[PDB]
Design an enzyme around this catalytic site. Sequence first.
Site, PDB file in Angstrom:
ATOM      1  N   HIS A   1      -0.062  -6.888  27.236  1.00 16.99           N
ATOM      2  CA  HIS A   1       1.145  -7.583  26.767  1.00 16.99           C
ATOM      3  C   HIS A   1       2.442  -7.230  27.502  1.00 16.99           C
ATOM      4  O   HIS A   1       3.235  -8.106  27.871  1.00 16.99           O
ATOM      5  CB  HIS A   1       1.358  -7.291  25.275  1.00 16.99           C
TER       6      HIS A   1
ATOM      7  N   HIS B   1      -4.574  -2.154  25.171  1.00 18.98           N
ATOM      8  CA  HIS B   1      -4.362  -3.605  25.161  1.00 18.98           C
ATOM      9  C   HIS B   1      -2.871  -3.946  25.156  1.00 18.98           C
ATOM     10  O   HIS B   1      -2.433  -4.808  25.919  1.00 18.98           O
ATOM     11  CB  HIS B   1      -5.075  -4.252  23.951  1.00 18.98           C
TER      12      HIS B   1
ATOM     13  N   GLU C   1      -2.372 -14.592  24.216  1.00 17.17           N
ATOM     14  CA  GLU C   1      -3.521 -13.672  24.194  1.00 17.17           C
ATOM     15  C   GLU C   1      -4.623 -14.095  25.187  1.00 17.17           C
ATOM     16  O   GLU C   1      -5.212 -13.227  25.823  1.00 17.17           O
ATOM     17  CB  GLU C   1      -4.107 -13.521  22.774  1.00 17.17           C
TER      18      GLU C   1
ATOM     19  N   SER D   1      -6.722  -7.088  29.303  1.00 12.96           N
ATOM     20  CA  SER D   1      -7.180  -5.751  28.902  1.00 12.96           C
ATOM     21  C   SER D   1      -8.686  -5.703  28.657  1.00 12.96           C
ATOM     22  O   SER D   1      -9.193  -4.704  28.156  1.00 12.96           O
ATOM     23  CB  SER D   1      -6.434  -5.259  27.641  1.00 12.96           C
TER      24      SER D   1
END
Length: 287
Positions: free
Chosen positions: A170, A165, A210, A229
């Site tokens: 990110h 993730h 997010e 992700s």
Amino acid sequence: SVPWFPKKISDLDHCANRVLELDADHPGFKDNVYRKRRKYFADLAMNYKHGDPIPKVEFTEEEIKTWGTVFQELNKLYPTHACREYLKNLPLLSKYCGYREDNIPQLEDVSNFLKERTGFSIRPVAGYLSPRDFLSGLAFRVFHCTQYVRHSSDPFYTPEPDTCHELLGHVPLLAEPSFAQFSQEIGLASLGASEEAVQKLATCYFFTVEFGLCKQDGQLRVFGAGLLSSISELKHALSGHAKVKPFDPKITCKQECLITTFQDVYFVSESFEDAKEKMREFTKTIK
Ligand SMILES: CCCn1c(=O)[nH]c(=O)c2c1nc(Cc1nc3cc4c(cc3[nH]1)OCO4)n2Cc1ccccc1
Ligand SMILES: [Fe+3]
């Protein structure tokens, strides 16, 4: 009475370790060996101090396979789903940081890459921090990052952040100057802010960094790391099935952050520049 907040990057040493150990429904909950591996990763983060090179890890064949499975499927989706900034930076990471199906990138290499591009850096984190402490890292362009890999029994779903993730969701956007500025300003706004304000900033972070969508050349694209992700939710978010609203901090900060299911609603930013402007206006009202 303003609460303590970090004043320089090394002050994150004093809050990064204030971690608030698997949940009952975790896929590795009954896996003694995986538990042991997680203890190894947690200790690396706890022992880390600002200025250290981030400890390099020899990932197991099993961990690399899990990463490869996730990496392969998500890369099929990114061209038709991800925002242009994501797609621009992902190939730089393949070139300079060893993003490949058969290789998990090292956090130290990714950190050095980000430092050059936008001044962002990585700090390994043991586990969950208060929203105050997590956002405070962003004020110094520090992203608190997990280093462990999800359990191999379920490569596609993870109830928590893992390093797949972090690296796929990110990092490619932290390499973009406009996004890095946007992210840093969430951190800056949070420093010494009220409990109330910190929570509202956290929710705005959640529905941009997010789970954010943006509009580009008249299309809806994904920029949220949690979407980038998650193979299933990435597809869902740009399907006609999803509920979508414009990003508007005073409204967005009222929305509940869901953790174990798809989001009920996604927020669409016009651009990273516009989201940044909207947050500037918002933060004035909660200082
Ligand atoms: C201020 C925002 C909320 N928030 C917080 O209050 N404190 C945090 O420590 C935090 C956080 N957010 C994220 C990073 C993160 N990314 C996630 C992606 C997800 C997710 C949870 C996530 N948490 O579930 C769906 O997909 N972290 C880092 C983190 C590291 C290790 C375990 C959990 C969380
Ligand atoms: Fe995340």
